[PDB]
Amino acid sequence: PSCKHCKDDVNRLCRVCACHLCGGRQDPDKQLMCDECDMAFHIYCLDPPLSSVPSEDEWYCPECRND
């Protein structure tokens, strides 16, 4: 398994290799990769949720965001 946490089970949530907030794998085109920690985040799982993917070069997740 590429991921030791969920063993690549598609029917299992995994906050390590899929959305770090909800554990879901759907919509990878809508999953933002943090430029610091490299975790994935659905745009619609963020608080606040984004209606689209940001055009900006770099993006930092809520855990890494420098307030």
Binding site: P28, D29, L32, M33, D35, A40, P54, S55, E56, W59
Partner: peptide
Amino acid sequence: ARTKQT
């Protein structure tokens, strides 16, 4: 920004 798909 970079997505999972990329």
